[PDB]
Amino acid sequence: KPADSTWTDDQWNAIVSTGQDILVAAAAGSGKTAVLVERMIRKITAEENPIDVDRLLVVTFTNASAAEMKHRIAEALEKELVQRPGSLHIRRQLSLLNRASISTLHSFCLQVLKKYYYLIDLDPGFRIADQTEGELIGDEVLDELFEDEYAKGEKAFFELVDRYTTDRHDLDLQFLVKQVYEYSRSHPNPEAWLESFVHLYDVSEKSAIEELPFYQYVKEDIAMVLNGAKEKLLRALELTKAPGGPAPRADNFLDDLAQIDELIQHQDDFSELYKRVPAVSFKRAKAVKGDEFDPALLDEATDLRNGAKKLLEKLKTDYFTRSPEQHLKSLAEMKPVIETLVQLVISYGKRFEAAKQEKSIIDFSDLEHYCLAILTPSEAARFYQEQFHEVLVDEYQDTNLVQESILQLVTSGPEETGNLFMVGDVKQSIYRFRLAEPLLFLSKYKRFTESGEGTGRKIDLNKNFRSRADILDSTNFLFKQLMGGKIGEVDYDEQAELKLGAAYPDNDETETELLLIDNETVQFEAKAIAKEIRKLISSPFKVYDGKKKTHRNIQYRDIVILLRSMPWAPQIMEELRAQGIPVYANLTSGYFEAVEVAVALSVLKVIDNPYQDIPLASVLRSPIVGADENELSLIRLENKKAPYYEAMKDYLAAGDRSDELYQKLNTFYGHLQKWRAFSKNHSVSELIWEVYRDTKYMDYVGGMPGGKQRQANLRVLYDRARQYESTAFRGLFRFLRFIERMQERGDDLGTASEQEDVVRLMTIHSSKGLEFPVVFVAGLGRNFNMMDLNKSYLLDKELGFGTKYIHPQLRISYPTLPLIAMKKKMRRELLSEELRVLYVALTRAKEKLFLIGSCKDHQKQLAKWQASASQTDWLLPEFDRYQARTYLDFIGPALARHRDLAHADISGHPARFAVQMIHSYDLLSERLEAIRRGEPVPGSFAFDEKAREQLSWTYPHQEVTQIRTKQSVSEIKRKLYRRPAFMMKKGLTAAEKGTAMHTVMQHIPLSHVPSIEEAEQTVHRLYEKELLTEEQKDAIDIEEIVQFFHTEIGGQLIGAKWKDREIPFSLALPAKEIYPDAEPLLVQGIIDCLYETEDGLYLLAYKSDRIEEGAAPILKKRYETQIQLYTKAVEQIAKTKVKGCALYFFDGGHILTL
Amino acid sequence: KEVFADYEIPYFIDGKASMLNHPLIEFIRSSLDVLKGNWRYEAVFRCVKTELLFPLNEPKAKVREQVDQLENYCIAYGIKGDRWTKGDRFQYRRFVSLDDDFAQTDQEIEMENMLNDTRDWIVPPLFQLQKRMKKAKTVQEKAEALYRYLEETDVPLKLDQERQRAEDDGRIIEAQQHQQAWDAVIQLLEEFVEMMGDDEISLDLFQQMIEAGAESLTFSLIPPALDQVFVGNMDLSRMYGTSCTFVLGANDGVLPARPDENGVLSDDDREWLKTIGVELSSGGRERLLDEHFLIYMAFSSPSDRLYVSYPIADAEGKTLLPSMIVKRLEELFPHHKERLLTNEPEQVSDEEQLMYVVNKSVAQSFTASQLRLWTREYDISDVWWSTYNVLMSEQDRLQSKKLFSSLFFRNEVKQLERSVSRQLYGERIQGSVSRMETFNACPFSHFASHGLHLKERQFFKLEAPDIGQLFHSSLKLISDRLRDEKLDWRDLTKEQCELFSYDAVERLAPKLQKEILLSSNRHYYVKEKLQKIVTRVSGILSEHAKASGFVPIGLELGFGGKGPLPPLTFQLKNGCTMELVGRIDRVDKAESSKGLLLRIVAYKSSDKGLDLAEVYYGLALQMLTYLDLSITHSADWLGMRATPAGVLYFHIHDPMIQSNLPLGLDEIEQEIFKKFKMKGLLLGDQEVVRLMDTTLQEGRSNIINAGLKKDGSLRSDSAAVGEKEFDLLTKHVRRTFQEAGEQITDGRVSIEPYKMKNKTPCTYCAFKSVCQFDESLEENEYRPLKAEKDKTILEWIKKEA
DNA sequence: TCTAATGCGAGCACGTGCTCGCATTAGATTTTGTTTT
């Protein structure tokens, strides 16, 4: 249904369209979130036939997006509720939203695991392990597997080891195993993908090179460089037509070109190229003598021709130094080694899963794979299909194959009539190293149509509502000449270009700036950045608030520096902090190089094992103790051969208390011993906190340069210890081992101020989804990371595993053809990703842009840029874009044709640029001493009285904060490690028999004196009522039961007005009556018997004490306080009075009165 | 717990503590881990450090100090498994070199005895436990074996002593939990044998169930007192007469809390079962809707004041969102101020900053931060100045003064007093080139090395220096056997090289790093790798011998100490004599027209050659020192005054050539041979070059880094220099040693690391936690060394002359 | 770990001059990071 309400037609399509799988290509700045929300709201808040929220499935990249989704949906539900308050449905959706399925894919998979744990071999109470924890488990099973393989000693294994290890150790092999396994985990069937490795090496001499898969990349590479050698020579030929250009040398060029064209004719024939390419030679350059020429152009043409020479020689050394038959033979010889490798990796996988199951543990990879195992479509899958009416997926361009196989599985119906709704943008796919596939998005882009006729719908959102025209124009201009072909993987045309949709009052300083620095380079860089920032702050720059239409002077909050990498961040932070610019940046590593963390860890180490000289010396020299070098050496002087700890003990054993160094070491020693005993009974976290308060080290570092950070570094160590308590539970032993093992393999943790007026320095990758008025992108004059394409082996999504030809005995190695193919492929893929990184970089802004890079010589590099910018067509030469290794190599030539820095439309594009050729030379107390002395500062402060009142204050009722409320009679009077039941003899103990008689006494009829028969009858009934255990019933004396009722007190018990037994009481006693100094505490108990006669109220209690005159005075005091507590209870609560108490003893039938 | 303890607030937590930290439970669990994992290092010392294995009525502080040194020993020697249960004594020797063999010092015997005593009281109870456990089949006898293990070690008595100590210190609640722990364990065993006493069970499943039961163990709830702050939940916790109620964690997902459905029955299951007629527990949507009633009961409980708080960030730094309740309260009470809770007082009013100072500890904590903030040009509130004055007005002020000493803290290093340095280093510094280089790189690193003699924890792991020693001693052995059988390196065949090298490594293996190469199959293969390396090196040395005019004089020739050559001696201002002993790797002599020629060759594991910049800064002084001594003593030791032929590095390795051309076996052999082309420095003349490579007629050399033209003169690519440069370099080395030794005796121990070519010595140093170097902290900076070209260096050495 | 400057001789073009072809060392430079409870 069509309607109008501030949406665009495309956005409208993305909201209302239903019936098939829909792909929404949301550009940067497009209201993808708002559209997604509105689309959901309509389904949730419809009038005709609404659906519940829990019938949907929203998959996000980060939890931030899911939470934001939840809140915006909530706000919309609130608005709807304002318009229709009465509706039960709309109200109910707000309650359901907390239980809604708005999660990440990992979280959803977790839900599936928790629900269908029984389908696969999984524990219902499984725990998702730490990355370090799992990797330590992996390391262990690797060592065990390797040890087992060495033990078997198979030839194939040694053959593998000898090839993929150094001459001294076998680490590199185990790293290879880990890598292959991880890379295999990114396929919905890891084992099959691993077993497809051998198909690449299953060749012979009779095999056609041009028919094999990997050759697809070998082909284009040749077609590229040859076409790169032709053009490079055509430009030389054109340079012969120039007036100052050399005319005779064109003959040589006309020869060389003819040779290259000859090669281009046979590009599809690899066998022919082997015969032709190595035979190509460039004739001696015909020297041009005369002053009618031009030395610059003369020497330039030679450079171009030598460029063709370089390219050709590179092509020959890449492919044509051995025959295609020899290539095939080499590739065929490597097959068994590949088979061994695969089986080894598979073994590691099975061992790793078994190990993880042993501890009820899964990975993040297991989170996807176990979920997928569950869904396979199985009953679970059909249930989830039934439940979800639609599945929404955000950032679809970063979805991997396993995630996709889960999405396609949980969605109901084929692609033509599916419910899978997905939104994203390939141009912003910057996560390929995490093995995500943007081709998954692009394939569905081409597969779909703009209509929904018998296929999936594609919808393109072009309008950018959040950024200025200058930004969009600059971006479109640059990436029109950069993205496309094999370097962009996507054609940069209309319907892909950014379109203006933001209403902006024009400013004159919004033009994109480029700052090129001549000649740390980062020093000059950051200084130039600082100057521009300072100029932007000093002279009022107005930032426009699009929502409220008001200009505000720019804050430090609105300025962000974006970097490709973070090693440059510290220096930039230091320089900007020096310039007076507030800077914040988050670090994902460098936590264990912080001095405070090193010292605190050293303390934990000494507490674990004091006989470690280095952590000890660390603690001693640290502010914790404060020993200086003279004092430390003094400690060593006492004992030179023994450990440093022994030397410390010896100094303590020989030193006098009048020494300051003695006080240091002694106080530390007492502290140390306390910690030793403390660590054994408490957790690690508790030990850390106790250390922190006993040393005040956290308080100390809080008062030194950068203490804000330092205290946080010490805080997260406590929090990390608490985190570890789940992994393998508590203990300094376990904790320190875990940290040590984490560092020894090279793993790290973050150093983990979001308030205004701070300049954020962060990675371009992290800036994804964020937006700022002013964006600085530096390091543009710095090389990309091509370290991936150097090793003897390589891993690919399609081709699988490539590797050099390695012969251990002959000590020879040389690259195999599929390896080189993979290198070319991975390079241009990497370059594509980098180009997309530059894209999100430039699109993260709203007002102004700042491009900054460095170089060696300005003019020569400008000519280098002009060399690439000679073509009339929009798109820059694909080979020149391929040869790029620096971000400048992308920006420069694209900017060379522009009017500011080459006819036709390219000059007239509405993009504006400002270029600055910067050079390196152009960038070039009373209170204090009072505190140092320990003396107070002089002055009258308003809070002096308050502070001194509060520091002296003591809680009025402190003496009763520790006093137990509930007490017991035995405990008041007061104011054995038993053996197992199956180790002792058969029952019958003192307490058993005593209680067994007590039960009879409290259950025996008090109507009249019973005989032996009546007593035995009562006992028998208590035996049948299960009031008495059979062992309690078997062992009983019958005499004392008779003896009591023959007594005086017994006779008075039988004859009484009123009787009661086992009367539970709670008594409130003033605190003073039990405690010496300075509010009722409770005292509970059970009075055995009470009876009332015409004389008064009498108390009775039974005791099974050992007796058989002299025992009576002892028994009197043994239960004195007890009886007094009983009498106090009756007299205070019942408000009556007790006249006389009586205690009966079974052992003999004695009675004493109190 | 920790915050209220620190803020002196008495509390009552309606929750039962876990026993998983109690020494008794850990003792049991880690014991079963010893039995299951076959006596792993971790399980064994987890078992020991619970102190329940400690000898009865022995000083805990002494027993611990014994266990520790046993631990360090177990770590360095990789003791595990049956080695614990073997009859063999743990043999100890503080220092062993594979070039000789001594006898045990009385000290080492004393130490070894102590170690074996410690082992002898640790093993038996743990051993006997493994005996019965293997033999026990049913559950009852396994639990019986476990309990016997508890009683034999006198655990009840040790727990009783511990709780008595706890009572004595006043920790009565801590004292009670011991008896609680024992009762818990005994009850667990009883229930176990009650349900499956006669059932035969495996050790793994027994441990699994013991572990499972131990995880459930809870200490009895600490009884409520007369005056406590009641901290509890919002589901089962009950209250009465509450005046003030604090509501915590008003975050989304937390309040209302999303109910985890999981069990045997799902929400759809229970829902359908509800429609059938079966009424079970509530569902997810039901318990989610009950949340409002719970929030209602919590909000309506306080009589006087209600506080609703929420954190915006988690422990790591992840953003936490406010609840729907916060917004609801913002609706019901639209003009109610939101109060900010922060540990950064400068973000709240002075009246709120005044609430911080509640006692001495927290006041000191905050005011130290406030003082640092004050040093950063901030007008901090006067309340902290008031509290500061109070903290310096009462008795305990030195503690506060010490805390506030951080305000002016820098990583300063006090120079060692003359008396202290003289006593520490000694009257005579008997050192080496390595020590002098260590000082030159960083003075403080030298102070911690050859001063404090701090030793890093020794591990049962094969490192690079150990392997280097293996190579050195191997070549030494081969050389000796060569002179024994009247053989020369020229006369060595492939078979002979292989057998010689293999046997040499075989001889050195059982004395290399606590016999690590014999400890596993993996290290066995490492041994074979090393044998292959020594083999190929032997072959290269053979080929080199057949193409060189230089004959090796003394291999591993030591100067000073017991060596044939006398030590180089230095005199200092302090009066302390400084002599350097060392071991020259190899010295070669050769006759020529210039007279006698001497060159020094050192076996390196790296290929990189001598850097004149590194020599200038005294970082590479080995070779030139060796050459200086060899030349200066060439008369009294050998024959006549000789001439420096040069210094050479030999790369010991087994290379893999990466050729892009189909090579033949001979071409491959040549490409391998070319990888051993020695780097270093040479004498700038044709005769010497021809003496080091007699094969070289014209072109480049495959043995030495030099070449020849048609004339006979060496090309500019040759790493050679005149005799002037050599003598100049040696004099520079001597001056470096003199100055270094001078600064050492003066007591200079400052932290001064260098940074040349983006390289720092700090990366290879283990004293990083001792020096506590902080670049951000001023007065602490690297020493930028300009990596100049050789000619610039030599020009500097000339201008210094 | 691959990329750029250096040394010197050989042969090809206009006996001498100059460009190429080879072989090497130094040499400079240098990551990205969600995800659960």
Ligand code: SF4
């Ligand atoms: S680490 Fe760097 S600074 Fe600290 S001592 Fe070793 S060398 Fe000197």
